[PDB]
Design a protein around this nucleic acid. Structure first.
Ligand SMILES: [Mg+2]
Ligand SMILES: [Mg+2]
Lengths: 72, 152, 182, 102, 127, 71, 66, 144
RNA sequence: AUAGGAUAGCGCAUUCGGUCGAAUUCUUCUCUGCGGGAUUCCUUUGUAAUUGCACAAGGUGAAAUUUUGGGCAACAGCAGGUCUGUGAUGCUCCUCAAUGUUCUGGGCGACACGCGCACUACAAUGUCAGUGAGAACAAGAAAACGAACCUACUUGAUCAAAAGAGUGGGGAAACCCCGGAAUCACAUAGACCCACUUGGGACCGAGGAUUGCAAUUUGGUCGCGCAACGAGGAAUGUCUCGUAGGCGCAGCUCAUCAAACUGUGCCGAUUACGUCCCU
């Protein structure tokens, strides 16, 4: 079985990212892509956008790894 | 707090701030100013023959010019061979072992020529390229701006 | 003006104690700012027990030809892994790592027919680190999950004694076989 | 005012040291300004060859080394005084070169 | 990119009689057509003036043939001759960039020409 | 493997027989005496001889030793 | 579930390949317990030394003297 | 006016040699190869360099300007040489311009935290031998 | 700051190998001919001793046990290899359409295959594309005034690379060189996102350069990649600390051409500290 990951954000997947992705104790692009059946690239782009909107906060950052968490 | 002077310290010079921050700020300043000369061959050619793909960054020439300016600041009287050694890379040779390949001197020559056109660098006595008066002043002022976090 | 060291300037080593009496003298809890502390730990026989446990994890992460000699990579991966563990557990990642090392290795296994024998405290610390790093490395081979996350769940699952951890699964089957031929 | 350099080169460390000491003693007797005996880095010529003449057996190798000892002595003295300083018995295997530094 | 999928997005695109995956980016999916590599695809994207961060299924048909004709006649778009695969045809002497089935046809024609000429490379290919 | 070779042992025993009032219980002073009282091409052997001479003197203080005859 | 014991004396290395180590273990039990100061002979694998700690699982079995 | 207080020390790790010059100054700063400690990358090596300061405390390095010139080796060896040079330069400055009741306390803390902070590592590359791809590993042997 | 975290400073603010600045002093690093230093030396209510010879821990120390890596290495052998190193040779063979010697063309590199040893892969602890910081070992020119050799810098450049010019310097601690090695780093807010795929380059097409007396060598550019290969059955090598492994670099052969070897630095582990099961 080969997984099918969407390359662009859908109408439902976008609002699912905007609402359901927050309040997650641990947020990473890989697990976000796992949940939403999307690509890790667009998952990271959406996570960066959420950080810009301040919905989630970035705790661990690196040139290749980004770790986010819910805003408290 | 991040901007505030540490204490009993004034101003800033080059090599006192982040090298990548200074290079990116200088490239952005060059792009906004627009007086730099960008060869048309930079949109097609690669940085070095050791590389296998195009630079893929639209501002790669500006970044390279900023890095060359920083290199001239660090090592006065340096030439295209020294800049090629600075900007070299390891080339994939296929099934054969990888060997270090110096960067093609063409882009370095073009960047140095653009810097002389801007007046930031000039040819030095007994060969080599050296920074100029306004080049040193601009480098130090931009280094101060970097820790000021103006960033253009 | 001196201050006690904290790993990565975030995690404190104060109160680091092994969960159980076992491996108390073989799990080192000495405070250190960074895992990378170059030293001659292999000159003596049991000198490796004095190595900081996070440094031992970083060394265990230095396997295979692609990962041989890359200790800065191991330090960065551990830096991310401790953050992920703290998010997952709401507990000190150093304490979670100590617990996982304490309960990640078998206490009894068979040897040569085969006769069950006990495991020395030194080998239990070694095998706990070996299994945990090995379990994460194979887990993160060709899946979307990156290495720092794959190492995080392994340490969290091992610390709770969950069968989802590769180290715990090996521990259960090894001790089960030891009792079978005991 | 005018300075002259003596370069002593040899394969024999004992011989080159003895010649340098003799030159230093002669210079001190002549009472000239001497900028010390400087021991330039010793240079090793290394050649590795197969031990066998046929290529049979374990590929055992042979390493031959040749060491080069060089000293320099700077002094303020004219040609006649330098020649008088240098003129003595010398030793085999070492050579002394005269140069005038500008 | 954080851009919604267009209603006209297609997973398979027809370019120069070749199928191209729409999931891949524009140059890395334009490299699928024979005669076009990574560098040529990037230069084609630059000449067409479209963003290289877009997907290959989001592009419209009004620029699909624009890309196809750029590939067909690269020299018209000031793409240098040394960037072309066939700089001097041994038969016609012209400069062109073979694409799709044309490269295979030209390779077969070259092999047949060497075979008929009875050269060492004709017989080596025949072996 | 730090056994004193028969050459070292014989040289140290001869040293003890020839000079007994001139020796001591420390190693460094004994070695300093050894350098003058012995002629050898090596310094490792001199150090070993001094060490075993110190050992011999320590044994001699407690009691007579076989192979050494003090007149 | 796992009773602890201290290594008192390290015996010889049992085994043809010399990987197992015969050892003497004193059970760590509180005063008044039946296993107080109980000395047992056991086989240990891995680097072991005196005054070490060892979880014995079941302490009924005794290693055969070598 | 005021006499200049200068102390020079060296720290070695593998081929790397770091010469540290320590001077009394109005404002304390430490630069390794002309780069400040905060600007030094990575944070892994910067932590090791700062380990020289944080073990004893910032008050001892207060009002002290230290510059480090490191030559030879790689980044890790250069960082270790620089931290050893900084630690040895501090102890040396105290030894020359302070009583021996202190300086010894600083040495104690340095030695307790890490011996290699004050004592150079003697390990060096083992020479390569013929018939061996490296110092230890031998040529592959085939029987059939 | 983009969203902009963490990470020292609190008489005298930092910088500027072209500012080619002057002056003065000195030897922290460096150079190197002789020196020293380590000897079980010191200490165990250690072991052993019950004379010893020693040994195990700890101490001291830069170094603590053949200090470490080499070199050298007895006496017997072997019908081991080499008569393709030699003006080392005994006996034989050829000897002027020569088993001599030169020259020309071809071979030593031809393939269905089997085997030894390498090199590159199977990707995300990755691949591209940037920036940063950074070694060591070395090598350089000529007979019966310089010229060959190695270099820096410029230019070509009003426009790809690979070139090609010019101008200097180095006989090599002087020039290269302040030797910008590659592993590596990067909070680069860079691309990709688990696919034989931007993994992997097998293999082939068209152009052009360059070595050379000769290219029917070697770079460089654009295509090809849909060549396997997703980690390898039975088997089987080497290795204990600056070691394995990873990563480069130099010398060497050498007009041209290293997946080789001899060195060299860089980054740096796991395990054991045993045993006679196997050999
Ligand atoms: Mg025979
Ligand atoms: Mg060969």
């Amino acid at each position: 079985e080969a997984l099918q990951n969407a390359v662009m954000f859908d109408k439902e997947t976008y609002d699912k990212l905007r609402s359901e992705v927050p309040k997650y104790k641990l947020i990473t692009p890989s697990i976000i892509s796992d949940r939403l059946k999307i690509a890790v690239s667009i998952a990271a782009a959406g996570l960066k956008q959420l950080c810009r909107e301040k919905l989630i906060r970035l705790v661990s950052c690196s040139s290749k790894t980004r770790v986010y968490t819910r805003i408290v | 707090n991040k901007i505030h002077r540490i204490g009993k310290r004034k101003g800033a010079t080059l090599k006192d701030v982040s090298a990548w921050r200074w290079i990116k700020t200088a490239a952005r300043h060059f792009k906004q100013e627009g007086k730099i000369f960008v060869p048309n061959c930079t949109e097609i050619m690669k940085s070095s023959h050791g590389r296998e793909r195009a630079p893929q960054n639209p501002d790669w020439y500006y970044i390279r010019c900023a890095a060359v300016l920083r290199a001239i600041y660090l090592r006065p009287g340096v030439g295209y061979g020294g800049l090629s050694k600075r900007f070299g890379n390891k080339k994939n040779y296929g099934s054969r072992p990888e060997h270090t390949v110096t960067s093609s001197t063409g882009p370095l020559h073009w960047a140095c020529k653009s810097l002389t056109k801007l007046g930031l660098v000039e040819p030095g006595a007994q060969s080599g390229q050296r920074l100029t008066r306004k080049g040193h002043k601009f480098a130090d002022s931009l280094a101060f701006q970097v820790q000021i976090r103006k960033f253009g | 003006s001196s201050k006690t060291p904290k790993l990565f300037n975030k995690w404190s080593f104060e109160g680091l104690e092994t969960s159980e009496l076992a491996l108390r003298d073989h799990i080192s809890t000495t405070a250190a700012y960074v895992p990378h502390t170059s030293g001659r730990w292999q000159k003596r026989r049991f000198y490796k027990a004095r190595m900081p446990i996070v440094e031992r994890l970083a060394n265990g992460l230095m396997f295979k030809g692609r990962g041989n000699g890359r200790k800065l990579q191991a330090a960065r991966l551990l830096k991310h892994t401790l953050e992920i563990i703290h998010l997952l557990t709401d507990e000190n990642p150093l304490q979670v790592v100590v617990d996982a090392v304490s309960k990640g290795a078998p206490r009894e296994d068979s040897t040569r027919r085969r006769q069950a024998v006990d495991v020395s405290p030194m080998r239990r610390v070694n095998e706990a680190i070996y299994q945990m790093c090995k379990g994460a490395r194979e887990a993160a081979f060709r899946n979307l999950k990156s290495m720092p996350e794959c190492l995080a769940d392994e340490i969290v699952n091992a610390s709770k004694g969950s069968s989802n951890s590769y180290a715990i699964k090996k521990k259960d089957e090894v001790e089960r076989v030891a009792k079978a031929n005991r | 005012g005018q300075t002259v350099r003596l370069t002593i080169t040899s394969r024999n460390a004992k011989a080159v040291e003895s010649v340098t000491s003799q030159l230093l003693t002669r210079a001190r007797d002549e009472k000239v300004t001497i900028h010390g005996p400087v021991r330039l880095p010793t240079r090793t010529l290394k050649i590795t060859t197969r031990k066998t003449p046929c290529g049979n057996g374990t590929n055992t190798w042979d390493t031959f080394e040749l060491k080069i000892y060089k000293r320099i002595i700077d002094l303020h003295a004219p040609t006649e005084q330098v020649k008088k300083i240098t003129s003595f018995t010398m030793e085999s295997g070492v050579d002394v070169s005269i140069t005038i530094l500008d | 990119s954080l851009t919604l999928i267009p209603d006209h997005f297609q997973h398979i695109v027809r370019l120069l009689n070749t199928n191209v995956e729409g999931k891949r980016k524009v140059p890395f999916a334009l490299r699928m057509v024979k005669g076009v590599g990574i560098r040529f695809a990037y230069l084609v994207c630059k000449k067409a003036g479209i963003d290289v961060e877009r997907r290959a299924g989001t592009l419209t048909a009004e620029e699909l043939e624009k890309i196809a004709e750029i590939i067909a006649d690269p020299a018209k778009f000031k793409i240098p001759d040394w960037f072309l695969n066939r700089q001097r045809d041994p038969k016609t002497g012209k400069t062109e960039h073979l694409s799709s089935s044309m490269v295979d046809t030209r390779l077969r024609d070259d092999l047949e020409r060497l075979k008929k000429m009875r050269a060492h490379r004709g017989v080596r290919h025949a072996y | 493997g730090k056994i004193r070779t028969k050459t070292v042992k014989r040289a140290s025993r001869q040293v003890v027989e020839k000079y007994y009032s001139k020796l001591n219980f420390d190693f460094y002073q004994n070695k300093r005496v050894i350098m003058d009282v012995t002629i050898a091409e090596s310094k490792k052997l001199k150090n070993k001889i001094a060490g075993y001479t110190t050992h011999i003197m320590k044994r001699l203080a407690r009691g007579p030793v076989r192979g050494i005859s003090l007149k | 579930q796992a009773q602890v014991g201290l290594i008192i004396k390290v015996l010889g290395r049992t085994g043809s390949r010399g990987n197992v180590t015969q050892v003497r273990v004193r059970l760590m039990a509180e005063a008044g317990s039946p296993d107080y100061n109980r000395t047992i002979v056991r086989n240990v694998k891995g680097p072991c030394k005196e005054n070490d700690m060892l979880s014995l699982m079941e302490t009924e079995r005794e290693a055969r003297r070598l | 006016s005021y006499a200049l207080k200068q102390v020079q020390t060296f720290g070695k790790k593998k081929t790397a040699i770091a010469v540290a010059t320590v001077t009394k100054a109005a404002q304390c700063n430490i630069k390794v190869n002309g780069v400040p400690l905060q600007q030094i990358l990575p944070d892994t090596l910067r932590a090791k360099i700062m380990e020289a300061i944080t073990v004893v405390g910032s008050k001892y390095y207060s009002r002290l300007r230290i510059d480090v010139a490191v030559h030879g080796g790689g980044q890790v060896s250069q960082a270790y040489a620089a931290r050893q040079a900084i630690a040895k330069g501090l102890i040396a400055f105290f030894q020359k311009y302070h009583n021996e009741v202190e300086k010894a306390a600083l040495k104690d803390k340095f030695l307790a935290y890490d011996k290699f902070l004050l004592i150079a590592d003697p390990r060096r590359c083992e020479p390569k031998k013929w018939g061996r791809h490296s110092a230890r590993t031998r040529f592959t042997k085939s029987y059939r």
